[PDB]
Amino acid sequence: SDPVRQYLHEIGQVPLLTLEEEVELARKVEEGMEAIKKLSEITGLDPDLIREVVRAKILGSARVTLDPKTVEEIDQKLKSLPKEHKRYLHIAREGEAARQHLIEANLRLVVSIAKKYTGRGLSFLDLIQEGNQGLIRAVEKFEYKRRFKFSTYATWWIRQAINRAIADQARTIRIPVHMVETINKLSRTARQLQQELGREPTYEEIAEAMGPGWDAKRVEETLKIAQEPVSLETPIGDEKDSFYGDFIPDEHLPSPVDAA
Amino acid sequence: LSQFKDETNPLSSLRHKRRISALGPGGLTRERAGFDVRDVHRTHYGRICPVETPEGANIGLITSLAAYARVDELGFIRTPYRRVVGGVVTDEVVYMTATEEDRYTIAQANTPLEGNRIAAERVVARRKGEPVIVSPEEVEFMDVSP
Amino acid sequence: GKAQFGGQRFGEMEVWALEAYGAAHTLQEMLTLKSDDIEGRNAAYEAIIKGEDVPEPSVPESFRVLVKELQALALDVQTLDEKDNPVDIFEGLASK
Amino acid sequence: KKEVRKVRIALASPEKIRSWSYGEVEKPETINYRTLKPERDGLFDERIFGPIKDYECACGKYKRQRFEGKVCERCGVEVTKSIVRRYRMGHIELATPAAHIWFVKDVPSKIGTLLDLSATELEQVLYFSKYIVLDPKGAILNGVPVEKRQLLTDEEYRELRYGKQETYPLPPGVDALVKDGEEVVKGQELAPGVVSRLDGVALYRFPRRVRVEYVTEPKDYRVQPHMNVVVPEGARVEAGDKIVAAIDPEEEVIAEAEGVVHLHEPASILVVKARVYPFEDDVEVSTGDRVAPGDVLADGGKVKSDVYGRVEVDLVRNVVRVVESYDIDARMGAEAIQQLLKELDLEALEKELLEEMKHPSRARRAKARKRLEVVRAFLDSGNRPEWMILEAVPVLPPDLRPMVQVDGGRFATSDLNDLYRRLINRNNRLKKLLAQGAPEIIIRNEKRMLQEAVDALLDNGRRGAPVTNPGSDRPLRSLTDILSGKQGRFRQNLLGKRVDYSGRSVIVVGPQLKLHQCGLPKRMALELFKPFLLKKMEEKGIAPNVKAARRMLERQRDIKDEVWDALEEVIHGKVVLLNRAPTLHRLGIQAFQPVLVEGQSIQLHPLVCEAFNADFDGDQMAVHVPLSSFAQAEARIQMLSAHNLLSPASGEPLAKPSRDIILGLYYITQVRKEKKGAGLEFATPEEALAAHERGEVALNAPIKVAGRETSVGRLKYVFANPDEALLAVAHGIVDLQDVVTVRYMGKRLETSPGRILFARIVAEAVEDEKVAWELIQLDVPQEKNSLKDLVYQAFLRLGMEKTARLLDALKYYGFTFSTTSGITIGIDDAVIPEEKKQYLEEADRKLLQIEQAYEMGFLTDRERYDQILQLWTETTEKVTQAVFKNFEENYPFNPLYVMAQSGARGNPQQIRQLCGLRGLMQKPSGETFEVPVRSSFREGLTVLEYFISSHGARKGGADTALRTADSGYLTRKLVDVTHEIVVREADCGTTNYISVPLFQPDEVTRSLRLRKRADIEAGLYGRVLAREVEVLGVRLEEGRYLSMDDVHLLIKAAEAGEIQEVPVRSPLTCQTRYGVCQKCYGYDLSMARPVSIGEAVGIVAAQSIGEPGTQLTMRTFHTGGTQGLPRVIELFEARRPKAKAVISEIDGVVRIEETEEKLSVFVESEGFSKEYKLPKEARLLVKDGDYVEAGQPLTRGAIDPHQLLEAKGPEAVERYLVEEIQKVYRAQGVKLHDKHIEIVVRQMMKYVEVTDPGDSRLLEGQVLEKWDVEALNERLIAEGKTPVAWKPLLMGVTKSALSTKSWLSAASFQNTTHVLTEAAIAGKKDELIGLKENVILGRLIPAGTGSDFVRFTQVVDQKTLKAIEEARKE
DNA sequence: CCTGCATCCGAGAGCTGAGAACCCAACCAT
DNA sequence: ATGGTTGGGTATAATGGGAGTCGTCTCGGATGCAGG
């Protein structure tokens, strides 16, 4: 049990990296990327297709839209390159291995970033998985030439993915991202106004502090739209025998008196 | 523990303010509480009323503070006793916990007196909750009132 | 509840008492025509308002809810006739 | 429309789920945040689940009917009724298979049993902690080849999959002792402070410097971390070539001339266990390919791989390194479990288990049978085991998981919506992440959470922390939580419902009502009978139409006078049902004719309060209105109060005088006694008359005249008829309690005018003088027992109508005479006897002695305590006797004494507490105090005594509060074990019977004494004689129902030694299927006549057993100077007693062998001699050299029922259980017939266990119903094979109820998950035999008017019958 | 190899009434 | 043609979490451990 401890154990089973190993891995993935684009332009095939087939071969048959016959036939079709071209394949494969190794090594940075986003409508493991997606994206778009540390560029992508996940999955009734950030800014302004005034602000103060284009009706509408629904199974009374839905009548089906 | 106040009459509110509950957050559960915690203990004398409790599943779990009882700063209920020395009942009143009460022989409040001297050869008393009959010299404390 | 203009609960032990009396028809009325047989209660009210006798009851809606909730647990609950052929208690509203 | 007869439950295949669904929900969106309309492809989409509006699509193209079945092209919504939103399912396609938790966590696991996997192993595999291997491909682990179904941990799998390798760092400034590309043995130090630990080739990682020769002189080039080395170690270079490629083109290291290149000062070493292969041209296999020995590796096939492994082509050194590995196929999770389940062949596995079942081992055979049960359930049902793993998850219709707008404008939702959202989110993220080729760790994590989300959706709070909504700690309500529990669907909405046409109100006494009438408030009747009232007012001229009548009735001030007359017309002849909770027995609901009254309180008849257990200190009752002609006929004929006068449990009157009625009748029927005369002598009556007239003798003094005992009243007042005596009473000449002489019925009776008046009351009530004279006992005061006997005899002799009339007359006259009697209670009425003082003082004497006997040394502490307690209890008994003797001698008309004697109110203990003394009290630990409460309630207690008694008062309150729940639980268990038993036929034809004994053995003196007459009545009354009986020159024929008079005759004959036991039919020996027959059941105890076919006797038996336990068993306990309900529950559950006694398994003689340290008993038969070693402190009921039979006890205590079953057999266990259950109820004073316990015990003994399957397909040790195996054996005899051999079993009520054939009743009882999963695997088909299943289905129960025996009856008049024949005569 | 014997886990425990980053740019819907 | 909604980007460095729960009692089955 306790899946967080299991995930932490699995993540700690992979050792960390030094600067030299990190730059080596990044250089290898960079050369693998350059190799796959070179191969794609040489053969005239879609770079995404060849990258997917190459990575499928690197993973193995364990990873079952492309029939096995298809990927195998393409793999034999890339075995028709005389020389100075199979080097592209080998560099690409080593780059894919470098990508995997780097992601596995730096998943702990995802954990470290995500551990301070708990308590906002998403469980810790969901935050970790969205951070992992962001880390994969950052590994995809990292340029090691700048001599910057891996975490410096990875942190922005991880935080962006986490914030997007909070905005998109925290509420049962979906609210778009712009409205979500508007609501957060409204709440922050309200709390600063409460701190300064020494009491709960009125809608006029919040509208004034928002800026141009904000009036009391607009803040009232925003606050009305920002309410989250309650459960039909909320316990009513001290004893464990009454639910909320016990007080909700049906207004859709006609009554016996109405039907007659 | 935060309850809609009962104010049918002033006595209702006064009763509600003096209620003691064994339930609540970090307390007992109504359906699985055994006889041991719902029984009138011998130390309830003068601290918790042995009579006023709700009938039903809450019997013994909700009780009432006794009339003269006072909760001390540490949270222990104390009850008052008159000091008696040499068979003479004095006006000094000492508020004591159950542990302190366990150390003495305490006479009943209805002990007959002439002036303030115990005018009875046989005195009904409590020793660690056990009813006993003692001589006036052995008496250490007396009840303030029934 | 009285505040909701609600009705009295006919619980398990009341059903036991009705069964012990052998009052099959009264119990069937309580289970269907008065609680959750929608078409049944509608027809009963219309029949009483027109002076006829109340009609025969049907399957209560709570059983349909039970069947639907058992299907949500990936369990195939099916009602059968005397020849073990399926009988559709949903009148065809749930068949593709 | 064909009727439903069976309900089947079975497993659902993924194809079945996909066939159910109308579409896949693709997004977790529920509704739009701004327009409040369902989102496309969401959990509420109208395209999938149906339209919200009736016959109108989402986009508004179609807004009319006639468009049924067509789907709008713009919106995709079919135009149909909106109600289909509560029927139509959806589905979710999982990215990876997930296991249904019901088949994983319900012990024993069905999947684990099928695959022979333990619970921990399945936990490890399913939740991604260990691998399970398929097709090992000849891999070697630790020198041992790997076999299928083997568990590999993450490190063990990784080592086998990829090979062993480690990296050793090198501190700066320290070089290595080896070269690049050389093999390293374990322990070979690579540095002055670094030592290797594995074998294999070692390679340098990041050499710091590069030495380049020139064709000679060397040169050194520094390698910075940001640039890499290309040239292989020890390889020549050419002019212009690059050596150390760099990020900057100008910063690259270019070879100036031709020279060798070497790499030195490594940063780390990588030692791997691998093979190495140099090449000098293009290679064939690229990095990431797996090869076998003897495959093409490089150089066009010159070099070949020699071991299994993975290839990496190091282009820097231009060498192929093949790391020794395998292509092992090990998987983890539900995907691997499903692969295993698909491959399973059930026939071969069944053959293997059948072969295993021949082992001499008992445990191995038991486990083989356990596996075979599941295997055969799957084989017979036709279900595939792989369906046990979910590929498509069904989605409940939206209307059962609503998102609704509350009156305040806020939304309310179900937890199921959030669970579905969580599942959909995790599935979508898994699909996205799979599309990116993410590493295995993240995929494992995602699949773990997906499995957990499926678990939470199906069964939340089973493993680990339950899922809760943010900001709360309340667990989310899953489907299983909805289905099961006291709050679940089955118990809260199917076995009980809220109903229409119902009300409730406070009740008040209705003393002027008749037995069949109840007082109903006017407004209550207006609301209850509203539709009938609307019809009546429309028929009249009160309103033009029904709507106008409703509008008139909706406003209180708009109601008129004629509508009340219309209401009186409506309810004429109709009845309503009154119910008081808790409904302990069936008489908790009764039918009454409503009399419209003013006010808001229901008026209840005084004589039905005892049946309802109702009083008038705030009780409330519910009112229901039966609607149809069938319901009204059932209520008026079967459930009317005046038709239910006898108890269904005992057959004794239950509607009978009580409280004030008894008091008044006793007051008028008691005779005055005076002491003024006190046995004076007179020779002639006239001298006695003159003595009274001069004032020396009282009127009622017992004098003797002329040798005859008489009184002055007998001689002075001789009345010719009762009218004259009552006229003299009206003139004050004599009192109702004075003894005079009256001529009645042609005889001269010395009696009182009150007793004559009572006789006249009965005679005029029953309209029969001779029968009334026969019924009554004239020469005794009328009290509770005599009045009850009168009611019973009147019932027997006259019928229900005349009995009810007599009951009403008795109630009226009892009330009238209790009003004017002058009964009151003052403080002086608690008379304290003088002897009490003496009794105390004498006690104060003995106490001193005891103290002396302890202060000198002739007594210990325990003995002193015991003697003090015994002295005080004897003193309390003496005080009680003195109190009641004083009452009887000096104040025979004292109010407390009269109340206690007449049975109106009070018992001797309470009277003693009022008058004499309270007595000893118990400490909270359960021990008595040493000093008693010597004051009564009249004298007033002291503070200390009050506090001492508070312990017992509180303990009694807690006793009530915490035992009523256990008794209610027992009643529910009995109902769920006996609900199917009905009277189904007139006679089963059996010739078996039971023998009810009339003499009980005694433990003391080992002698037979006649049983208590109440016990014989409880065991014999109403039964059918199995054999002819000849007693006292009287023939009781076979097939005779034993009346009460017959039982008394049998007792009288047994007292003369003419009979020892009575053979009767019983439910224990009935042969009817799913019930009993009329002859084996006997009387309907509530009607004193043979039971009608179709009576639900199982429910009646369960209620009869449960009702007394709820209140009167160890009601308010009075704190005054293995038992009870726990013993009864232990017996009904077949619990093994903790105080178990020892029985003799075989026949023989007794030889007790006792040494100073140990004790034993030997039973010596003629064949064998067995031994029983017993504690020395144990008790022995036998003596040395005595004879004991098999199963006869040798020790005191509770007997183990199962050991007794093994020893003596089934009938002995039946008799033991019935008698031991009856003991507890008899000790409490409860009258209850043996039949009900016999029914429950018959249900307890329903099953057998196979010892030898013979020529059947059954298995050894398989539990199955007795009827089924008997039928199987009979058919085997018909076919000519060997019978199945079986032994009876004994199961508690809980296990017997959960072992029934019908899965609906078992699921609605308890343990819903286990019952449902077993039934679904087996594909069980419910035949709807019992009552609970038909109640759940909302059908007509097969009992009473729903019985097939009576429900097809036709009725027709003479006119129609003939002409139907005239048509046939043609 | 069999057996018995503590040990652990799961499932019960009456009825009715009421009570917490920001910004910028492209893109479908209506 | 307009808002409302959605996708993409930020570059010193950062690298394994945190609340919690200890006052029920029995009973029945599944099970691992001890002995012979």
Ligand SMILES: Nc1nc2c(ncn2[C@@H]2O[C@H](COP(=O)(O)OP(=O)(O)OP(=O)(O)OP(=O)(O)OC[C@H]3O[C@@H](n4cnc5c(N)ncnc54)[C@H](O)[C@@H]3O)[C@@H](O)[C@H]2O)c(=O)[nH]1
């Ligand atoms: N089947 C049944 N019958 C009962 C019960 N208890 C009493 N009777 C009958 O009622 C007559 C008068 O009994 P009472 O003289 O006791 O009066 P009451 O109405 O019970 O009121 P209270 O004195 O309790 O006043 P309250 O202010 O405390 O009421 C508010 C609080 O009481 C409790 N409470 C109030 N009402 C009920 C109720 N209906 N059911 C259960 N608990 C109730 C509850 O806990 C609530 O939260 C008795 O003779 C019996 O026929 C019972 O448990 N079950």
Ligand SMILES: Nc1ccn([C@@H]2O[C@H](COP(=O)(O)CP(=O)(O)OP(=O)(O)O)[C@@H](O)[C@H]2O)c(=O)n1
């Ligand atoms: N939880 C409960 C409490 C009560 N009841 C019902 O209320 C009645 C009176 O209990 P009560 O305590 O109100 C009085 P009673 O015992 O008759 O009085 P006395 O000895 O002081 O004269 C019981 O007999 C039950 O039918 C219930 O079903 N569930």
Ligand SMILES: [Mg+2]
């Ligand atoms: Mg109460």
Ligand SMILES: [Mg+2]
């Ligand atoms: Mg009452």
Ligand SMILES: [Mg+2]
């Ligand atoms: Mg009473």
Ligand SMILES: [Mg+2]
């Ligand atoms: Mg005369």
Ligand SMILES: [Zn+2]
């Ligand atoms: Zn449309």
Ligand SMILES: [Zn+2]
């Ligand atoms: Zn029979």
